[PDB]
Design a protein around this motif. Sequence first.
Motif, short mmCIF file in Angstrom:
data_model
loop_
_atom_site.label_atom_id
_atom_site.label_comp_id
_atom_site.label_asym_id
_atom_site.label_seq_id
_atom_site.Cartn_x
_atom_site.Cartn_y
_atom_site.Cartn_z
N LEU A 82 0.84 -1.19 0.00
CA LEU A 82 0.00 0.00 0.00
C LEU A 82 0.88 1.24 0.00
O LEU A 82 1.27 1.72 1.06
N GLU A 83 1.19 1.76 -1.20
CA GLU A 83 2.07 2.92 -1.39
C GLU A 83 1.71 4.14 -0.52
O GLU A 83 2.64 4.65 0.12
N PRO A 84 0.45 4.64 -0.44
CA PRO A 84 0.21 5.85 0.38
C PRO A 84 0.46 5.66 1.89
O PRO A 84 0.88 6.62 2.54
N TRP A 85 0.24 4.45 2.42
CA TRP A 85 0.47 4.16 3.83
C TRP A 85 1.97 4.13 4.12
O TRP A 85 2.41 4.69 5.13
N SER A 202 -9.37 8.65 1.57
CA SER A 202 -8.17 9.10 0.86
C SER A 202 -7.25 7.95 0.41
O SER A 202 -6.48 8.15 -0.52
N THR A 203 -7.37 6.73 1.03
CA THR A 203 -6.61 5.54 0.61
C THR A 203 -7.14 5.14 -0.77
O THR A 203 -6.34 5.08 -1.70
N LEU A 206 -5.95 7.72 -3.52
CA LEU A 206 -4.52 7.69 -3.88
C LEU A 206 -4.01 6.29 -4.24
O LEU A 206 -2.86 6.13 -4.64
N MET A 207 -4.88 5.29 -4.13
CA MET A 207 -4.63 3.86 -4.36
C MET A 207 -4.42 3.38 -5.80
O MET A 207 -3.47 2.66 -6.07
N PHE A 208 -5.37 3.70 -6.70
CA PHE A 208 -5.44 3.18 -8.05
C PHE A 208 -4.68 3.99 -9.11
O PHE A 208 -4.86 3.77 -10.31
N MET A 209 -3.79 4.87 -8.65
CA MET A 209 -2.94 5.66 -9.55
C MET A 209 -1.52 5.83 -9.00
O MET A 209 -1.35 5.97 -7.78
N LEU A 213 1.03 10.31 -10.98
CA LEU A 213 -0.29 10.84 -11.34
C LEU A 213 -0.97 11.52 -10.16
O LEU A 213 -1.44 12.65 -10.30
N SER A 214 -1.02 10.85 -8.99
CA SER A 214 -1.65 11.40 -7.79
C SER A 214 -0.94 12.64 -7.22
O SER A 214 -1.54 13.35 -6.42
N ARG A 215 0.31 12.94 -7.66
CA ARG A 215 1.06 14.12 -7.20
C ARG A 215 0.47 15.44 -7.73
O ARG A 215 0.59 16.47 -7.07
N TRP A 216 -0.17 15.39 -8.93
CA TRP A 216 -0.79 16.57 -9.56
C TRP A 216 -2.29 16.42 -9.78
O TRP A 216 -2.99 17.44 -9.85
N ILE A 217 -2.80 15.17 -9.89
CA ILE A 217 -4.22 14.90 -10.07
C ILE A 217 -4.97 15.13 -8.74
O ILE A 217 -6.00 15.81 -8.70
#
Lengths: 473, 466, 464
Positions: A82-85, A202-203, A206-209, A213-217
């Motif tokens: 899980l990248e965001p965690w 918020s998981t 920010l999960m499926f990208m 992408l999530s840094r600017w989307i």
Amino acid sequence: PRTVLPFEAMPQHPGNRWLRLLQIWREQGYEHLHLEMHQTFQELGPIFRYNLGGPRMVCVMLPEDVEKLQQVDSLHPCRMILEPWVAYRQHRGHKCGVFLLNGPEWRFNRLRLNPDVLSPKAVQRFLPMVDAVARDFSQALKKKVLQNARGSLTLDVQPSIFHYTIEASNLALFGERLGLVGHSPSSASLNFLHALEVMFKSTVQLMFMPRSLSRWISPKVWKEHFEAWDCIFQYGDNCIQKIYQELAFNRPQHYTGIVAELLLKAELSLEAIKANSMELTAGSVDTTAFPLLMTLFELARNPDVQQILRQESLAAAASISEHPQKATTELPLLRAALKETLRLYPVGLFLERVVSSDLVLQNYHIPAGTLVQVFLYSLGRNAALFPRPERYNPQRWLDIRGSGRNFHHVPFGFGMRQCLGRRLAEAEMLLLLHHVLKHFLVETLTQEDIKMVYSFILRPGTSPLLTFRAING
Amino acid sequence: TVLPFEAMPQHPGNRWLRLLQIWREQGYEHLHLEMHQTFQELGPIFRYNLGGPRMVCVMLPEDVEKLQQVDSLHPCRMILEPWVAYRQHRGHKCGVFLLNGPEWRFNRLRLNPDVLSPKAVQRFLPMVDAVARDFSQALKKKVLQNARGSLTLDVQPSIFHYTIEASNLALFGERLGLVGHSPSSASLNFLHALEVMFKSTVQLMFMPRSLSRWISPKVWKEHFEAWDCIFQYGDNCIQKIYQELAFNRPQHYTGIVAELLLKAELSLEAIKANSMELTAGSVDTTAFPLLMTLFELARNPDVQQILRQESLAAAASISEHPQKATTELPLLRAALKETLRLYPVGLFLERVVSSDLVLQNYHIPAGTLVQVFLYSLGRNAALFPRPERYNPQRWLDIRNFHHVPFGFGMRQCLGRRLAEAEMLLLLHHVLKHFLVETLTQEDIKMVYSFILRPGTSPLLTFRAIN
Amino acid sequence: TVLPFEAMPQHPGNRWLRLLQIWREQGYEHLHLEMHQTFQELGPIFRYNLGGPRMVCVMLPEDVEKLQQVDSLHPCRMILEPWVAYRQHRGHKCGVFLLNGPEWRFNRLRLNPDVLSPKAVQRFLPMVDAVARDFSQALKKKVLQNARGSLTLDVQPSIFHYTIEASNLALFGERLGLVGHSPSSASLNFLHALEVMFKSTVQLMFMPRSLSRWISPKVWKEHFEAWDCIFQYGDNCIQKIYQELAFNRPQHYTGIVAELLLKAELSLEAIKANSMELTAGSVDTTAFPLLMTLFELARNPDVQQILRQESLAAAASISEHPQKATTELPLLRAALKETLRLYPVGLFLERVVSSDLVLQNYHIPAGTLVQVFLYSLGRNAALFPRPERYNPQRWLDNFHHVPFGFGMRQCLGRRLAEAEMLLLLHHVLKHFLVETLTQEDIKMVYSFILRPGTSPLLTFRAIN
Ligand code: HEC
Ligand code: HEC
Ligand code: HEC
Ligand SMILES: Cn1cc(C(=O)N2CC(Oc3cncc(N4C(=O)c5ccc(Cl)cc5C4(C)C)c3)C2)cn1
Ligand SMILES: Cn1cc(C(=O)N2CC(Oc3cncc(N4C(=O)c5ccc(Cl)cc5C4(C)C)c3)C2)cn1
Ligand SMILES: Cn1cc(C(=O)N2CC(Oc3cncc(N4C(=O)c5ccc(Cl)cc5C4(C)C)c3)C2)cn1
């Protein structure tokens, strides 16, 4: 002489990562994921591949493919991290808990966690603690019920059940009563619950990208997510700072919780205990509470099933009062009612494994490196594996000893990486339900099936109005 | 032979550079450490460039002795302009702290018998004791519900609600229900109002009204809004006791303010003013050295056990006569002297001297503000051997003017005795039932925000004694 | 020789100047003092220029007696347009207050036996008594903890939480836990919703839908948002009892609404509508004359002690049988009559007359709205000697007492309100002395109901 087919021969999901991520950005969640995946299995069959562009992804259901997945479980089973965690812990300089670990680091942590959290000997130690909270829940409810002329209290139980899970889990982990059962919710408990809600929302976002992408989307969603973790970590460190100070001056002779044992043993570094203790404290709130409310609802919808469970709980009431540890073996149909609830409403939804060796699933070659996702929703509602799937039937779990239905019940996973808080969650659910059945009749006019919502864990959309009618004086 | 005022070491600082730093940082949180360093560099005496007015800074008790002898029948203090500005504005009389000359002496002489006097202390001591008893009782209840028979927490919120409860009972004879229960909106907004007023006092304290009105116009509004909440809470108290006493004059003791209103020696406006000064003044001042005593005992278990043995032996005599706590607990009284030696809430003793004097063989002229620094005085190794050692025994081994955290003479802290009773009794009941513990063995960083308050509240474990 | 309608004195102010001040001041807080002055300067009868529709203002009980004689089988009330507008919008049925004609009569006759009737009063009287007992008990606890054995406070918040508790127990047989504890978010938001609704009712009342659409568009949203909260609280109440009764029909009495649902003489929608009127209607109305009685007794200690002696002698019989409180306390019942004389919550009694009638020798035609002014009526020196004197004895020494109205359309919550007031006061008198330095008359403010502007500081001194 059936020929094994290649990975590419497999039905492909009609969707795509791009439409999915833009849609998730627009809707600010994926609340219908379970119904989207369920429909795809109804259309494509028991196995299908998802186009992640480059990485291989296989979607399965059926105990058949769970058994084979366990067979490939290495000494170190892998899970899509899980990248965001992981991003939050790396940012604030924290160690990762079992869930966010892989390889030898996971195995080292897990082997030191199992004896005090999952093991039967540990369950016998915290079972009487959990029982005291469950006893206090019904006794507070009885107090409120008896003040009404009809000797009943109709309410939304969701707030109480969450404050029960927070209380019972705190007592089991730290040996501390927070005073949330039978009293007004605190600012600390409400802000924690809300922080967990925001963190999961918020998981999903920010999960499926990728972070590219999530840094600017979704730049605001990252701040939102980290602010949520800041509150979760504030509550969790407060827990650990208290127990660490208490244990530093006095090493207690008796059992005073799970985390006390981990700190006393000192097999894991303070940082590793802090990390895993955080996973247990935060992890035991939203997960245990949702199938508990679903069991209460399903019993209010099935009075016939409810009365069978009540008769069991009332006969076994004496032995459990004497030895709360007996609840495990003395209540088979209540244990089986939880199996039935976790089949219809699986709060974990998926079992994921980045497979370490080539394998064959449904006559297709699944290469090493493929992420195999087992869908617990479709698996449970399948009419061929579970006859009359829509029927709430705890009896379907009793005489299955030698039915080859070992892999039919997998809501906590399998093997070495199976849910750590499985046994604690089960104890919290059993005992609350046992004490509710002994004193109250659960009723509802809301006969309509609750729409489930995907928000990292499968939670109900609405909380029904449940009447708790006193039985005795 | 005698050195002029100008021959004095001068502070390296500026009346303007300090004024701009207070503007930028919105406070002078490091004032105590700045003053302490200057005494370490310049010596026991130094002058402050106020750009006209004379200011001396002293740290020796031989200078504290010289200052009391030159104290008049009406001792003079540098009146706090922003506080006086609020009372002028809303049309209020000034309390004994904001008064000078005959008006101060008239007010003080009518306040001393019911607030400071030993006979008054014997009347409110059992009241305060009941609150202290109710504090440990509530803490025990919470402690026993935990598996390890202990409760680790930040005590600061509880101690403040204790001081509010105990002070309200002593002054008005009214239980607010803040000890052992959830804090009220009234108590939380009062606490916050005091913090702002104290914060905004520092912000306007070091610049004339002429500068602070255009440099910090928002800070004046902020300060007056804070006083509006403080005076709202205080008047609510006064209008309750005044109505209660109008219909029935009680035979028994029902608080300090009841005695003042019944005696009617001071005008309702003067009672209102001084009662405001006691209600608001007792909340923060008593709470900070109490938390510091609790902390210092949690880092000094050896000292804590000496105090526990005293409190446990004298437990019986204090239970039947709470007024016995004063004489029956010498070491615990000395532990407070030790908290105030190292952590002076008052920080300074100020006097606008009425006649010329010679402090440290330097001529100090009449009208010169003399400021005694209590932080440096208490940290002098020659007056206090091992000055960074919590040794309450150093107040027993004694063979004068060493203990001045409440001031000296006629102007000495009017709340001295009520504060002492509140501290002494809370600590007595805590020692009888709990062990105070902490891993935080590092000195707390103190913060100056009009009063010397700790920056961080440590995590204190309260372990049930059996 | 009977005179025509036009011969009557006319009110000096035009309807538009009044409509613009309601826009500017966002209310009509001085309405009672404006109407009182007009009766003082014009006489006992005057007409109001509605610019077409006929309107008559009366203040004499002889004229109430006559207005009753024309009532008919279905008495007609000037229907409150903004309240009806909300119901019509969200698809709700109208309660007995907002109904007229056969629909009102059908609803009323099914409501009277369980809400107004003496047999019903005997069933909820012990329930209300338990709340009143809990109020003084909690107050005593707080009082005894203070050195002077007294508690000086603003009682208004407690009295409102009493009326909410007592009315909830009487209607639904459910204790909310508001008496002797901290107010809940649900209770505070409800109280506030009622406040905003009554304020925005005044703002939209004196102008049609057409003017209010563009003059006060924000006030309509404000009003509907207030009703949204009132209806949220009320549906929560009815959803609980409806579910409870669906699984078990209780043998014993469990409240007013339980009886209505069990009888099922009215449709669920009609029960929902009327239950909403009772739940919301019983909070502000009962609470304001209760605070006024406590105040008037704190300024009249002589009257207070007469009532105390009555309540203390009759303490035993009322403890055993709470339903005896009604007959055993005549002076205390008369003290309420006295408070509703000086401080009438429902300032007016209105009727759109169905047949022609004669009032003060003037012809009042059919269709005419006749408004009885309860403030001037109860302040008439000829009907009540020394009218400013709070003397409950005057009621012991013929349409003189009409604060709840008259006939078939009289207040439905009249007997529940009386029981709530009598009992709270009985238990307060038994244990405490009510005192105050505030000896000046409280300025009343018209906010749909006549509510006090300020709540005085009342001291509650323990007797023993
Ligand atoms: C005490 C905290 C806690 C609670 C409560 C908890 N879990 Fe878990 N769960 C974990 C941890 C930790 C893991 C990580 C497993 C690992 O890598 O070792 C996990 C993993 C899982 C997994 C995936 C395991 C696999 O083989 O991939 C599922 C599914 C799961 N939990 C379901 C549940 C359900 C269902 C509940 C209750 C209704 C629940 N969990 C309650 C801590 C918790
Ligand atoms: C109940 C009220 C109250 C409390 C509590 C209180 N004070 Fe005071 N204090 C005052 C007042 C009032 C004065 C001004 C006395 C005067 O001018 O007559 C004062 C003045 C002082 C002064 C200046 C005295 C001088 O001679 O210059 C110091 C120092 C002081 N207090 C320290 C303390 C300390 C230290 C504590 C607690 C540990 C404390 N006070 C608690 C009311 C209080
Ligand atoms: C339980 C709810 C409830 C309470 C409490 C209540 N009322 Fe009423 N009241 C009503 C309802 C409902 C009506 C409508 C009667 C109708 O249309 O038939 C009403 C109507 C009235 C009327 C008009 C009667 C007529 O003949 O014109 C008056 C006047 C009145 N109430 C006064 C009061 C006063 C004064 C109080 C408090 C002291 C009060 N009410 C308390 C429910 C209540
Ligand atoms: C495509 N997809 C994968 C998943 C997934 O990995 N999971 C596991 C989720 O359910 C769960 C089951 N048990 C415990 C959990 N936890 C929590 O709820 C929790 C909260 C805070 C922390 Cl710091 C750790 C956890 C853990 C991870 C312990 C989750 C479902 C969901 N959707
Ligand atoms: C360069 N400098 C001088 C000072 C100074 O004058 N003092 C005295 C301050 O400490 C004190 C000691 N005792 C009581 C207090 N009070 C308060 O805390 C307080 C609060 C509200 C009011 Cl309406 C009055 C007071 C008083 C003034 C009564 C303060 C420290 C601080 N910095
Ligand atoms: C020119 N004008 C007429 C009036 C008027 O009609 N009335 C009656 C008002 O007082 C009253 C008396 N009894 C009960 C009431 N109610 C309330 O207070 C209330 C609140 C919410 C609802 Cl959903 C229903 C009601 C009812 C209607 C039940 C009011 C005064 C006011 N001004």
